[PDB]
Write a protein that binds this ligand. Structure first.
Ligand SMILES: C[C@](COC(N)=O)([C@@H](Nc1c(C=O)cc2cc(C(N)=O)ccn12)C(=O)O)S(=O)O
Length: 244
Protein backbone atom coordinates (compact mmCIF):
# COMPACT_ATOMS: atom_id res chain seq x y z
CA UNK A 1 0.00 0.00 0.00
CA UNK A 2 1.36 3.43 0.99
CA UNK A 3 5.12 3.78 1.31
CA UNK A 4 6.81 5.12 4.44
CA UNK A 5 8.26 7.89 2.27
CA UNK A 6 4.78 9.09 1.32
CA UNK A 7 3.58 9.07 4.96
CA UNK A 8 6.63 11.02 6.08
CA UNK A 9 6.23 13.49 3.22
CA UNK A 10 2.51 14.01 3.93
CA UNK A 11 2.95 14.61 7.66
CA UNK A 12 5.96 16.84 7.02
CA UNK A 13 3.82 18.92 4.62
CA UNK A 14 1.21 19.36 7.36
CA UNK A 15 3.78 21.25 9.43
CA UNK A 16 5.17 23.06 6.36
CA UNK A 17 1.65 24.28 5.50
CA UNK A 18 1.24 25.74 8.99
CA UNK A 19 4.50 27.58 8.35
CA UNK A 20 5.96 26.33 11.61
CA UNK A 21 8.50 23.77 12.85
CA UNK A 22 7.33 20.67 14.70
CA UNK A 23 7.21 16.94 15.24
CA UNK A 24 4.71 14.27 16.22
CA UNK A 25 5.75 11.10 17.99
CA UNK A 26 3.63 7.99 17.67
CA UNK A 27 4.09 4.95 19.87
CA UNK A 28 2.92 1.44 18.96
CA UNK A 29 3.70 -1.07 21.67
CA UNK A 30 7.32 -0.25 22.48
CA UNK A 31 8.19 1.27 19.09
CA UNK A 32 8.51 5.03 18.59
CA UNK A 33 7.91 6.71 15.23
CA UNK A 34 8.91 10.30 14.64
CA UNK A 35 7.22 12.41 11.94
CA UNK A 36 7.04 16.10 11.09
CA UNK A 37 9.29 18.75 9.58
CA UNK A 38 11.78 19.17 12.43
CA UNK A 39 12.65 15.67 13.67
CA UNK A 40 15.45 16.80 16.01
CA UNK A 41 12.79 18.40 18.25
CA UNK A 42 11.90 14.88 19.43
CA UNK A 43 14.74 14.86 21.96
CA UNK A 44 14.77 18.54 22.92
CA UNK A 45 13.36 19.86 26.19
CA UNK A 46 10.50 22.37 26.32
CA UNK A 47 8.35 23.67 29.15
CA UNK A 48 5.32 21.31 29.39
CA UNK A 49 2.89 24.21 29.78
CA UNK A 50 -0.72 22.99 30.01
CA UNK A 51 0.22 19.33 29.52
CA UNK A 52 1.45 19.38 33.11
CA UNK A 53 -2.15 19.61 34.33
CA UNK A 54 -2.46 15.88 33.74
CA UNK A 55 0.20 15.19 36.33
CA UNK A 56 -0.93 18.11 38.51
CA UNK A 57 -4.39 16.50 38.73
CA UNK A 58 -2.90 13.03 39.38
CA UNK A 59 -0.85 14.42 42.26
CA UNK A 60 -3.58 16.58 43.77
CA UNK A 61 -6.17 13.81 43.67
CA UNK A 62 -3.77 11.20 45.02
CA UNK A 63 -2.54 13.35 47.87
CA UNK A 64 -6.13 14.30 48.74
CA UNK A 65 -5.73 17.97 47.84
CA UNK A 66 -9.04 17.82 45.99
CA UNK A 67 -11.70 15.47 44.63
CA UNK A 68 -13.15 15.11 41.15
CA UNK A 69 -16.43 16.59 42.36
CA UNK A 70 -15.01 19.59 44.21
CA UNK A 71 -15.97 22.92 42.70
CA UNK A 72 -13.13 25.43 42.57
CA UNK A 73 -14.88 28.77 42.91
CA UNK A 74 -13.84 31.78 40.86
CA UNK A 75 -12.63 34.45 43.32
CA UNK A 76 -14.18 37.23 41.25
CA UNK A 77 -10.86 38.61 40.05
CA UNK A 78 -10.31 39.35 36.37
CA UNK A 79 -8.77 36.40 34.56
CA UNK A 80 -7.03 36.16 31.20
CA UNK A 81 -10.23 34.78 29.65
CA UNK A 82 -13.94 35.25 30.45
CA UNK A 83 -14.40 31.49 30.10
CA UNK A 84 -12.16 31.08 33.17
CA UNK A 85 -14.18 33.47 35.33
CA UNK A 86 -16.44 30.72 36.62
CA UNK A 87 -16.66 27.93 39.18
CA UNK A 88 -15.36 24.60 37.98
CA UNK A 89 -14.22 21.09 38.84
CA UNK A 90 -10.74 19.81 38.02
CA UNK A 91 -12.13 18.06 34.96
CA UNK A 92 -13.79 21.25 33.70
CA UNK A 93 -10.58 23.21 34.31
CA UNK A 94 -8.79 20.47 32.35
CA UNK A 95 -10.95 20.92 29.24
CA UNK A 96 -10.75 24.71 29.52
CA UNK A 97 -7.04 24.79 30.36
CA UNK A 98 -8.10 26.83 33.41
CA UNK A 99 -4.61 27.60 34.70
CA UNK A 100 -5.89 29.58 37.71
CA UNK A 101 -7.57 26.45 39.02
CA UNK A 102 -4.43 24.38 38.61
CA UNK A 103 -2.25 27.04 40.23
CA UNK A 104 -4.54 26.79 43.25
CA UNK A 105 -4.23 22.98 43.22
CA UNK A 106 -0.47 23.41 42.95
CA UNK A 107 -0.52 25.80 45.94
CA UNK A 108 -2.63 23.34 47.93
CA UNK A 109 -0.10 20.60 47.17
CA UNK A 110 2.85 22.77 48.17
CA UNK A 111 6.38 23.06 46.78
CA UNK A 112 7.94 20.32 48.92
CA UNK A 113 5.28 17.72 48.19
CA UNK A 114 5.21 18.79 44.53
CA UNK A 115 8.97 18.46 44.02
CA UNK A 116 8.87 15.08 45.73
CA UNK A 117 5.95 13.85 43.61
CA UNK A 118 7.32 15.16 40.32
CA UNK A 119 10.61 13.43 41.16
CA UNK A 120 8.78 10.24 42.09
CA UNK A 121 7.02 9.96 38.71
CA UNK A 122 10.17 11.07 36.89
CA UNK A 123 8.52 13.74 34.76
CA UNK A 124 10.80 15.45 32.24
CA UNK A 125 13.90 16.89 33.90
CA UNK A 126 11.90 16.71 37.17
CA UNK A 127 13.02 20.20 38.22
CA UNK A 128 10.27 22.52 39.49
CA UNK A 129 12.46 25.17 41.11
CA UNK A 130 11.17 27.44 43.89
CA UNK A 131 7.86 28.76 42.47
CA UNK A 132 5.24 26.06 43.00
CA UNK A 133 2.67 27.95 40.93
CA UNK A 134 4.38 28.49 37.57
CA UNK A 135 7.27 26.08 37.15
CA UNK A 136 5.53 24.29 34.26
CA UNK A 137 4.90 27.48 32.28
CA UNK A 138 8.18 29.38 32.35
CA UNK A 139 10.60 26.78 33.66
CA UNK A 140 12.67 25.36 35.18
CA UNK A 141 10.57 22.27 34.49
CA UNK A 142 11.06 20.93 30.97
CA UNK A 143 10.27 17.73 29.08
CA UNK A 144 10.84 16.30 25.60
CA UNK A 145 8.25 15.07 23.07
CA UNK A 146 9.59 11.53 23.48
CA UNK A 147 9.08 11.82 27.24
CA UNK A 148 5.56 13.16 26.67
CA UNK A 149 4.45 10.18 24.54
CA UNK A 150 5.94 7.81 27.12
CA UNK A 151 3.95 9.64 29.80
CA UNK A 152 0.83 9.41 27.66
CA UNK A 153 1.60 5.73 27.08
CA UNK A 154 1.99 5.10 30.82
CA UNK A 155 -1.18 6.93 31.79
CA UNK A 156 -3.17 5.24 29.04
CA UNK A 157 -2.12 1.83 30.36
CA UNK A 158 -2.33 2.81 34.03
CA UNK A 159 1.41 2.33 34.52
CA UNK A 160 1.94 5.59 36.40
CA UNK A 161 2.64 5.23 40.14
CA UNK A 162 -0.85 6.19 41.34
CA UNK A 163 -3.93 4.24 42.36
CA UNK A 164 -5.69 2.72 39.39
CA UNK A 165 -8.76 4.79 40.25
CA UNK A 166 -6.81 8.07 40.28
CA UNK A 167 -5.45 7.47 36.78
CA UNK A 168 -8.92 6.52 35.56
CA UNK A 169 -10.43 9.65 37.08
CA UNK A 170 -7.96 11.83 35.20
CA UNK A 171 -8.19 9.94 31.91
CA UNK A 172 -11.94 10.64 31.97
CA UNK A 173 -11.07 14.34 31.97
CA UNK A 174 -9.05 14.00 28.76
CA UNK A 175 -11.57 12.65 26.26
CA UNK A 176 -11.59 15.30 23.55
CA UNK A 177 -12.98 13.48 20.54
CA UNK A 178 -14.54 10.38 19.02
CA UNK A 179 -13.79 9.49 15.42
CA UNK A 180 -15.14 6.53 13.45
CA UNK A 181 -15.32 4.32 16.53
CA UNK A 182 -12.04 5.67 17.91
CA UNK A 183 -11.75 7.75 21.07
CA UNK A 184 -9.09 10.42 21.39
CA UNK A 185 -7.73 11.43 24.78
CA UNK A 186 -5.36 14.39 24.94
CA UNK A 187 -4.29 17.61 26.59
CA UNK A 188 -3.24 20.63 24.53
CA UNK A 189 -0.63 23.08 25.72
CA UNK A 190 0.72 26.48 24.71
CA UNK A 191 3.66 28.09 26.48
CA UNK A 192 3.27 31.78 25.74
CA UNK A 193 5.44 32.85 28.64
CA UNK A 194 8.59 31.58 26.94
CA UNK A 195 10.49 32.31 23.73
CA UNK A 196 10.15 30.78 21.30
CA UNK A 197 6.61 29.70 22.16
CA UNK A 198 5.93 25.98 22.34
CA UNK A 199 2.74 24.16 21.39
CA UNK A 200 1.65 20.68 22.54
CA UNK A 201 -1.05 18.07 21.96
CA UNK A 202 -0.24 14.94 23.91
CA UNK A 203 -2.60 12.00 24.30
CA UNK A 204 -3.54 8.68 22.77
CA UNK A 205 -6.20 7.13 20.61
CA UNK A 206 -8.31 4.31 21.94
CA UNK A 207 -9.30 2.13 19.00
CA UNK A 208 -12.42 -0.02 18.83
CA UNK A 209 -10.26 -3.12 19.20
CA UNK A 210 -9.18 -1.69 22.55
CA UNK A 211 -5.63 -0.93 21.39
CA UNK A 212 -4.21 2.34 22.74
CA UNK A 213 -1.91 4.36 20.48
CA UNK A 214 -0.13 7.24 22.29
CA UNK A 215 1.15 10.34 20.52
CA UNK A 216 2.68 13.73 21.24
CA UNK A 217 2.64 16.64 18.82
CA UNK A 218 5.09 19.44 19.58
CA UNK A 219 5.72 22.55 17.52
CA UNK A 220 6.64 26.23 17.68
CA UNK A 221 3.67 28.52 18.17
CA UNK A 222 3.84 31.82 16.30
CA UNK A 223 1.58 34.79 17.06
CA UNK A 224 -1.27 35.05 14.59
CA UNK A 225 -1.42 31.26 14.66
CA UNK A 226 -4.51 29.39 15.83
CA UNK A 227 -4.36 26.85 18.63
CA UNK A 228 -6.59 24.66 16.47
CA UNK A 229 -3.71 24.06 14.05
CA UNK A 230 -2.18 21.70 16.61
CA UNK A 231 -5.42 19.76 16.49
CA UNK A 232 -5.67 19.86 12.69
CA UNK A 233 -2.11 18.67 12.18
CA UNK A 234 -2.47 15.94 14.81
CA UNK A 235 -5.73 14.60 13.36
CA UNK A 236 -4.46 14.70 9.78
CA UNK A 237 -1.27 12.91 10.83
CA UNK A 238 -3.17 10.29 12.83
CA UNK A 239 -5.55 9.80 9.90
CA UNK A 240 -2.78 9.64 7.31
CA UNK A 241 -1.22 6.83 9.31
CA UNK A 242 -4.55 5.06 9.59
CA UNK A 243 -4.64 5.42 13.38
CA UNK A 244 -8.12 6.96 13.21
C1 LIG B 1 -4.23 27.43 24.04
C2 LIG B 1 -4.60 26.78 25.41
C3 LIG B 1 -6.03 26.19 25.39
O1 LIG B 1 -6.92 27.08 24.77
C4 LIG B 1 -8.22 26.72 24.68
N1 LIG B 1 -8.48 25.37 24.53
O2 LIG B 1 -9.12 27.52 24.72
C5 LIG B 1 -4.52 27.86 26.55
N2 LIG B 1 -3.12 28.03 27.02
C6 LIG B 1 -2.53 28.30 28.25
C7 LIG B 1 -1.90 27.29 29.21
C8 LIG B 1 -1.82 25.81 28.98
O3 LIG B 1 -0.96 25.55 27.87
C9 LIG B 1 -1.44 27.92 30.32
C10 LIG B 1 -1.73 29.33 30.18
C11 LIG B 1 -1.48 30.43 31.05
C12 LIG B 1 -1.90 31.73 30.61
C13 LIG B 1 -1.67 32.92 31.50
N3 LIG B 1 -2.12 34.09 30.96
O4 LIG B 1 -1.16 32.91 32.61
C14 LIG B 1 -2.54 31.91 29.33
C15 LIG B 1 -2.77 30.80 28.50
N4 LIG B 1 -2.35 29.58 28.98
C16 LIG B 1 -5.10 29.23 26.21
O5 LIG B 1 -4.48 30.29 26.30
O6 LIG B 1 -6.51 29.36 25.73
S1 LIG B 1 -3.42 25.42 25.67
O7 LIG B 1 -3.59 24.45 24.56
O8 LIG B 1 -3.76 24.64 27.11
Amino acid sequence: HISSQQHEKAIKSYFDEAQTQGVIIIKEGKNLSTYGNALARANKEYVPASTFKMLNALIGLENHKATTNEIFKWDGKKRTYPMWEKDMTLGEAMALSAVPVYQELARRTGLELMQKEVKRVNFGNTNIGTQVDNFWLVGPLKITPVQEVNFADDLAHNRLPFKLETQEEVKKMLLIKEVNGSKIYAKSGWGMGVTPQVGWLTGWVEQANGKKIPFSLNLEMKEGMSGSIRNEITYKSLENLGII
